[PDB]
């Protein structure tokens, strides 16, 4: 038939269940509602089994594990892991071209008149990369994993999310080829070797190369552009990429929403505890 679960039913099923409910079709409302009742019980049973398993076998958190898996792969390739402050300045945002008129500006959480929660890692990474160039003539390769914040409103969007951002200044070889190779290192280390690279428009970067899995963006990457590099006193080929770690984990683990695999007081590693 053509009858689907209602939007409310889909939300109720996804609360405790990680099935693919949006695909189901039914002949009529009675059959839809009977199937909903059955699948709500399955979802709750499966959820409880997962919680009992985590209690019986304590483990590192799934998001922490993914971070460690990727970070170890990048260190093995000669990337320095950095940690930078969550607070950044209004000026730092302006140097990314994120000023009052831009849409991303409206998504920023301000702490005071001059400081904000970072919505991206690039401002701090540009700073650190430029300073590291003072200490070497070779490539400068760094990465950070940490929380970024944006006002949002819900598909694959969190207000606090974990970005992995990498930067490579002065790469040996063509900057685009080098960028594609480091994307490959990350994706394989994350357990997601199958993905598409797709050119997309960008307010900040003009054009990005995005990593998409079945049409879902999990990363944006860019070489420069020159104006952005020069705004950070960078005067050589440069590239970087930013990955959404909860998005990666959600896709790999087949969680039905993006809210289950990261930080939460309701979910733990895909299962709802309350």
Ligand X SMILES: [NH3+][C@@H](Cc1ccc2[nH]c3ccccc3c(=O)c2c1)C(=O)O
Residue ranges in contact with ligand ANP by CB under 6 A: 120, 150, 152, 157-158, 161, 163, 217-220, 242-244, 246-247
Residue given tokens 């970067």 in the structure block: 205
Which of 25, 29, 34, 111 touches a second copy by CB under 8 A? Answer: 111
Contacts for 206 with CB less than 8 Å, ≥ 6 apart: 222, 225
Taking CB under 8 A as the binding criterion, the range among 6-14, 71-79, 187-195, 200-208 that sits at the site for a second copy is: 71-79
Q: Is 113 annotated as a binding residue?
A: no
CA torsion sign, 231 to 151 to 168 to 194? Answer: negative
Q: Is 157 annotated as a binding residue?
A: yes
Which of 43, 66, 70, 82 touches a second copy by CB under 8 A? Answer: 82
223 contacts which partner out of a second copy, ligand X, ligand ANP, none, CB within 5 to 8 A by kind? Answer: none
- Alpha-carbon span 7 to 146, nearest angstrom: 33
Interface with ligand X includes 182 (CB under 6 A)?
no
Instruction: Write the CA distances from 108 to 96, 104, 153, integer angstroms.
Output: 13, 7, 13
Nearest distance, CB of residue 185 and a second copy, angstroms: 14
98 contacts which partner out of ligand ANP, Mg ion, ligand X, none, CB within 5 to 8 A by kind? Answer: none
- Alpha-carbon span 45 to 50, nearest angstrom: 9
Q: CB-wise, 30 or 76, nearer to a second copy?
A: 76
Interface with ligand X includes 98 (CB under 6 A)?
no
Q: Is 3 annotated as a binding residue?
A: no
Q: Is 217 annotated as a binding residue?
A: yes
240 contacts which partner out of a second copy, ligand ANP, ligand X, none, CB within 5 to 8 A by kind? Answer: ligand X
Sheet containing 238-244, strands listed edge to edge, beginning at the edge strand earlier in sequence: 80-81, 140-149, 160-169, 238-244, 216-223, 206-213, 196-202
Sort strands 238-244 and 216-223 into parallel, antiparallel or unpaired: antiparallel
Cα angle value 227/211/153 (rounded, 5°) = 85
**Which residues line the annotated binding site?**
150, 152, 157-158, 161, 217-218, 220, 244, 247
In the complex, which residues of this chain contact a second copy (CB under 8 A)? 48, 51-52, 54-55, 58-61, 63-64, 68, 71-72, 75, 78-87, 109, 111, 124, 127-128, 131-132, 134-136, 138, 140-141, 146-147, 149, 159-160, 262-265, 268, 273-274
In the complex, which residues of this chain contact ligand X (CB under 6 A)? 120-122, 125-126, 129, 165, 167, 205, 220-222, 238, 240-242
């Amino acid at each position: 038939g053509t009858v689907k679960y209602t939007d409310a039913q889909i939300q109720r099923l996804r609360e405790y269940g990680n099935g693919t409910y949006e695909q189901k079709v039914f002949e009529d409302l009675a059959s839809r509602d009977a199937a909903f009742s059955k699948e709500m019980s399955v979802a709750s049973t499966d959820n409880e089994k997962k919680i009992k398993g985590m209690i019986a076998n304590p483990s590192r958190h799934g998001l922490t594990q993914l971070m460690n898996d990727i970070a170890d792969a990048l260190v093995a390739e000669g990337f320095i892991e950095v940690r930078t402050p969550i607070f950044i300045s209004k000026d730092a945002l302006a140097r990314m071209t994120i000023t009052e008129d831009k849409p991303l500006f409206k998504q920023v959480f301000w702490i005071d008149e001059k400081r904000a929660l970072r919505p991206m890692l690039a401002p701090n990474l540009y700073s650190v990369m430029r300073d590291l160039r003072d200490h070497t003539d070779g490539p400068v390769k760094i990465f950070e994993m940490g929380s970024c914040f944006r006002k949002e409103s819900s598909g694959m969007h969190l207000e606090e999310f974990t970005m992995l951002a990498l930067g490579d200044m002065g790469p040996r070889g063509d900057a685009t080829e080098v960028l594609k190779n480091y994307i490959s290192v990350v994706m394989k280390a994350a357990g997601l070797p199958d993905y598409d690279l797709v050119q997309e428009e960008s307010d900040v970067y003009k054009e990005t190369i995005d990593v998409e899995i079945n049409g879902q963006e999990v990363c944006s990457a860019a070489v420069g552009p020159h104006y952005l590099d020069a705004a950070h006193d960078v005067h050589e080929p440069c590239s970087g990429a930013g990955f959404g770690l909860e998005r990666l984990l959600t896709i790999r683990e087949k969680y039905s929403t993006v809210k289950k695999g990261g930080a939460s007081i309701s979910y733990l590693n895909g299962a709802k505890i309350n």
